[PDB]
Symmetry: C2
Protein backbone atom coordinates (compact mmCIF):
# COMPACT_ATOMS: atom_id res chain seq x y z
CA UNK A 1 0.00 0.00 0.00
CA UNK A 2 2.48 2.53 -1.30
CA UNK A 3 2.40 5.83 -3.15
CA UNK A 4 3.56 6.49 -6.66
CA UNK A 5 6.73 7.90 -5.03
CA UNK A 6 7.25 4.62 -3.16
CA UNK A 7 6.95 2.83 -6.49
CA UNK A 8 9.53 5.17 -8.06
CA UNK A 9 11.86 4.32 -5.13
CA UNK A 10 11.78 0.63 -6.06
CA UNK A 11 13.07 1.29 -9.61
CA UNK A 12 16.72 0.85 -10.54
CA UNK A 13 18.51 4.13 -9.60
CA UNK A 14 19.37 4.82 -13.32
CA UNK A 15 15.87 6.17 -13.98
CA UNK A 16 16.52 9.09 -11.74
CA UNK A 17 18.56 10.80 -14.41
CA UNK A 18 15.46 11.09 -16.62
CA UNK A 19 13.43 13.17 -14.17
CA UNK A 20 16.02 15.90 -13.44
CA UNK A 21 14.53 18.49 -15.80
CA UNK A 22 11.02 17.98 -14.32
CA UNK A 23 12.13 19.72 -11.10
CA UNK A 24 12.83 23.42 -11.02
CA UNK A 25 12.10 26.43 -8.73
CA UNK A 26 8.33 25.76 -9.17
CA UNK A 27 8.74 22.29 -7.72
CA UNK A 28 11.77 20.84 -5.85
CA UNK A 29 12.29 17.15 -4.99
CA UNK A 30 12.24 17.91 -1.24
CA UNK A 31 8.54 18.63 -1.64
CA UNK A 32 7.95 15.61 -3.92
CA UNK A 33 9.46 13.37 -1.25
CA UNK A 34 8.34 14.76 2.12
CA UNK A 35 4.83 15.46 0.86
CA UNK A 36 4.51 12.57 -1.64
CA UNK A 37 1.03 11.52 -0.45
CA UNK A 38 -0.29 15.08 -0.34
CA UNK A 39 1.17 15.85 -3.79
CA UNK A 40 -0.46 12.68 -5.17
CA UNK A 41 -3.86 13.68 -3.76
CA UNK A 42 -4.37 16.95 -5.64
CA UNK A 43 -5.76 17.38 -9.14
CA UNK A 44 -2.86 19.36 -10.61
CA UNK A 45 -3.98 18.65 -14.11
CA UNK A 46 -7.30 20.51 -13.63
CA UNK A 47 -5.57 23.28 -11.56
CA UNK A 48 -3.17 23.89 -14.47
CA UNK A 49 -6.09 25.44 -16.36
CA UNK A 50 -7.84 27.13 -13.44
CA UNK A 51 -6.44 30.23 -11.72
CA UNK A 52 -8.56 29.94 -8.57
CA UNK A 53 -7.84 26.24 -8.17
CA UNK A 54 -4.10 26.66 -8.75
CA UNK A 55 -3.98 29.40 -6.12
CA UNK A 56 -5.84 27.27 -3.57
CA UNK A 57 -3.51 24.32 -4.19
CA UNK A 58 -0.36 26.46 -3.77
CA UNK A 59 -1.79 28.05 -0.57
CA UNK A 60 -2.38 24.51 0.78
CA UNK A 61 1.06 23.34 -0.35
CA UNK A 62 2.53 26.24 1.71
CA UNK A 63 0.49 25.17 4.73
CA UNK A 64 1.79 21.56 4.42
CA UNK A 65 5.33 22.88 3.93
CA UNK A 66 5.05 24.70 7.30
CA UNK A 67 3.92 21.47 9.02
CA UNK A 68 6.95 19.73 7.49
CA UNK A 69 9.17 22.54 8.79
CA UNK A 70 7.78 22.03 12.30
CA UNK A 71 8.54 18.31 12.08
CA UNK A 72 12.12 18.57 10.81
CA UNK A 73 12.76 21.33 13.38
CA UNK A 74 11.66 18.95 16.18
CA UNK A 75 13.81 16.24 14.59
CA UNK A 76 16.68 18.76 14.34
CA UNK A 77 17.36 17.73 10.73
CA UNK A 78 19.57 20.70 9.87
CA UNK A 79 19.83 20.12 6.14
CA UNK A 80 16.09 19.84 5.66
CA UNK A 81 15.24 22.83 7.83
CA UNK A 82 17.77 24.88 5.89
CA UNK A 83 16.60 23.66 2.44
CA UNK A 84 12.89 23.90 3.26
CA UNK A 85 13.06 27.53 4.39
CA UNK A 86 14.78 28.52 1.13
CA UNK A 87 12.12 26.56 -0.81
CA UNK A 88 9.37 28.35 1.15
CA UNK A 89 10.74 31.77 0.04
CA UNK A 90 10.77 30.64 -3.62
CA UNK A 91 7.25 29.23 -3.38
CA UNK A 92 5.96 32.42 -1.73
CA UNK A 93 7.20 34.23 -4.81
CA UNK A 94 5.35 31.74 -7.06
CA UNK A 95 2.15 32.40 -5.05
CA UNK A 96 2.44 36.12 -5.87
CA UNK A 97 3.37 35.38 -9.45
CA UNK A 98 1.98 32.42 -11.40
CA UNK A 99 0.40 29.56 -9.36
CA UNK A 100 -0.96 27.90 -12.53
CA UNK A 101 2.55 27.31 -13.76
CA UNK A 102 3.47 25.47 -10.55
CA UNK A 103 0.42 23.18 -11.24
CA UNK A 104 1.73 22.60 -14.79
CA UNK A 105 5.15 21.55 -13.52
CA UNK A 106 3.78 19.19 -10.86
CA UNK A 107 1.26 17.70 -13.34
CA UNK A 108 4.10 17.00 -15.85
CA UNK A 109 6.32 15.53 -13.17
CA UNK A 110 3.68 13.06 -11.97
CA UNK A 111 2.78 12.01 -15.54
CA UNK A 112 6.47 11.52 -16.34
CA UNK A 113 6.74 9.13 -13.37
CA UNK A 114 3.70 7.18 -14.69
CA UNK A 115 5.48 6.88 -18.07
CA UNK A 116 8.71 5.72 -16.41
CA UNK A 117 6.93 3.25 -14.13
CA UNK A 118 5.15 1.68 -17.14
CA UNK A 119 8.40 1.51 -19.09
CA UNK A 120 10.44 -0.05 -16.30
CA UNK A 121 11.45 -3.64 -16.96
CA UNK A 122 9.86 -6.01 -14.42
CA UNK A 123 9.74 -9.84 -14.53
CA UNK A 124 6.37 -11.59 -14.62
Amino acid sequence: GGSQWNQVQQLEIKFLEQVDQFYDDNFPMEIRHLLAQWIETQDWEVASNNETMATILLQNLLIQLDEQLGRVSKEKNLLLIHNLKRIRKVLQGKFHGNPMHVAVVISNCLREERRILAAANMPI
Copy 2:
Protein backbone atom coordinates in the same frame (compact mmCIF):
# COMPACT_ATOMS: atom_id res chain seq x y z
CA GLY B 1 34.55 12.19 19.82
CA GLY B 2 32.52 14.33 17.46
CA SER B 3 33.16 16.86 14.73
CA GLN B 4 32.43 20.55 14.85
CA TRP B 5 29.31 19.68 12.79
CA ASN B 6 28.23 17.17 15.45
CA GLN B 7 28.63 19.94 18.02
CA VAL B 8 26.50 22.30 15.90
CA GLN B 9 23.83 19.55 15.79
CA GLN B 10 23.54 19.59 19.59
CA LEU B 11 22.68 23.32 19.69
CA GLU B 12 19.11 24.55 20.00
CA ILE B 13 17.64 24.62 16.44
CA LYS B 14 17.22 28.47 16.60
CA PHE B 15 20.90 29.01 15.79
CA LEU B 16 20.40 27.60 12.36
CA GLU B 17 18.83 30.81 11.16
CA GLN B 18 22.14 32.64 11.72
CA VAL B 19 24.16 30.52 9.30
CA ASP B 20 21.87 30.76 6.25
CA GLN B 21 23.87 33.47 4.46
CA PHE B 22 27.13 31.50 4.91
CA TYR B 23 25.95 28.92 2.35
CA ASP B 24 25.68 29.79 -1.30
CA ASP B 25 26.56 28.19 -4.70
CA ASN B 26 30.24 28.01 -3.60
CA PHE B 27 29.28 25.85 -0.63
CA PRO B 28 25.94 24.07 0.03
CA MET B 29 24.91 22.45 3.33
CA GLU B 30 24.70 19.00 1.69
CA ILE B 31 28.48 19.11 1.43
CA ARG B 32 28.91 20.54 4.96
CA HIS B 33 26.91 17.62 6.33
CA LEU B 34 27.87 14.56 4.27
CA LEU B 35 31.54 15.52 4.23
CA ALA B 36 31.75 17.22 7.66
CA GLN B 37 34.95 15.41 8.71
CA TRP B 38 36.67 15.98 5.37
CA ILE B 39 35.64 19.66 5.33
CA GLU B 40 37.00 20.07 8.88
CA THR B 41 40.34 18.53 7.89
CA GLN B 42 41.41 21.04 5.23
CA ASP B 43 43.17 24.36 5.81
CA TRP B 44 40.67 26.58 3.98
CA GLU B 45 42.02 29.67 5.62
CA VAL B 46 45.48 29.24 4.02
CA ALA B 47 43.91 28.09 0.68
CA SER B 48 41.88 31.32 0.58
CA ASN B 49 45.13 33.16 -0.19
CA ASN B 50 46.79 30.52 -2.36
CA GLU B 51 45.62 29.75 -5.91
CA THR B 52 47.38 26.39 -6.20
CA MET B 53 46.19 25.23 -2.79
CA ALA B 54 42.60 26.33 -3.41
CA THR B 55 42.56 24.45 -6.70
CA ILE B 56 43.91 21.27 -5.09
CA LEU B 57 41.31 21.46 -2.31
CA LEU B 58 38.42 21.93 -4.77
CA GLN B 59 39.71 19.04 -6.96
CA ASN B 60 39.75 16.84 -3.81
CA LEU B 61 36.32 18.07 -2.73
CA LEU B 62 35.02 16.93 -6.16
CA ILE B 63 36.63 13.52 -5.68
CA GLN B 64 34.94 13.14 -2.24
CA LEU B 65 31.64 14.34 -3.72
CA ASP B 66 31.82 11.47 -6.28
CA GLU B 67 32.39 8.93 -3.48
CA GLN B 68 29.33 10.36 -1.70
CA LEU B 69 27.35 10.02 -4.94
CA GLY B 70 28.33 6.36 -5.18
CA ARG B 71 27.16 5.80 -1.60
CA VAL B 72 23.77 7.50 -1.88
CA SER B 73 23.23 5.74 -5.23
CA LYS B 74 23.78 2.35 -3.51
CA GLU B 75 21.48 3.52 -0.71
CA LYS B 76 18.96 4.69 -3.35
CA ASN B 77 18.51 8.02 -1.54
CA LEU B 78 16.75 9.79 -4.40
CA LEU B 79 16.77 13.30 -2.95
CA LEU B 80 20.49 13.25 -2.21
CA ILE B 81 21.47 11.75 -5.55
CA HIS B 82 19.40 14.39 -7.29
CA ASN B 83 20.73 17.30 -5.17
CA LEU B 84 24.35 16.12 -5.25
CA LYS B 85 24.51 15.89 -9.05
CA ARG B 86 23.24 19.48 -9.37
CA ILE B 87 25.81 20.58 -6.76
CA ARG B 88 28.56 18.77 -8.70
CA LYS B 89 27.72 20.81 -11.87
CA VAL B 90 27.89 24.07 -9.89
CA LEU B 91 31.19 23.10 -8.25
CA GLN B 92 32.68 22.10 -11.62
CA GLY B 93 31.97 25.63 -12.73
CA LYS B 94 33.70 27.01 -9.61
CA PHE B 95 36.76 24.84 -10.43
CA HIS B 96 36.99 26.53 -13.85
CA GLY B 97 36.32 29.93 -12.35
CA ASN B 98 37.52 30.95 -8.89
CA PRO B 99 38.55 28.13 -6.48
CA MET B 100 40.00 30.64 -3.98
CA HIS B 101 36.57 32.11 -3.44
CA VAL B 102 35.14 28.69 -2.52
CA ALA B 103 37.95 28.47 0.14
CA VAL B 104 36.92 31.92 1.44
CA VAL B 105 33.29 30.86 1.83
CA ILE B 106 34.11 27.57 3.59
CA SER B 107 36.65 29.32 5.86
CA ASN B 108 34.00 31.92 6.88
CA CYS B 109 31.38 29.26 7.44
CA LEU B 110 33.59 27.22 9.78
CA ARG B 111 34.68 30.30 11.75
CA GLU B 112 31.06 31.41 12.07
CA GLU B 113 30.23 28.02 13.63
CA ARG B 114 33.13 28.48 16.12
CA ARG B 115 31.64 31.88 17.06
CA ILE B 116 28.16 30.40 17.48
CA LEU B 117 29.41 27.41 19.48
CA ALA B 118 31.26 29.73 21.89
CA ALA B 119 28.21 31.97 22.22
CA ALA B 120 25.74 29.16 22.86
CA ASN B 121 24.38 29.08 26.39
CA MET B 122 25.44 25.88 28.21
CA PRO B 123 25.11 25.10 31.94
CA ILE B 124 28.24 24.36 33.97
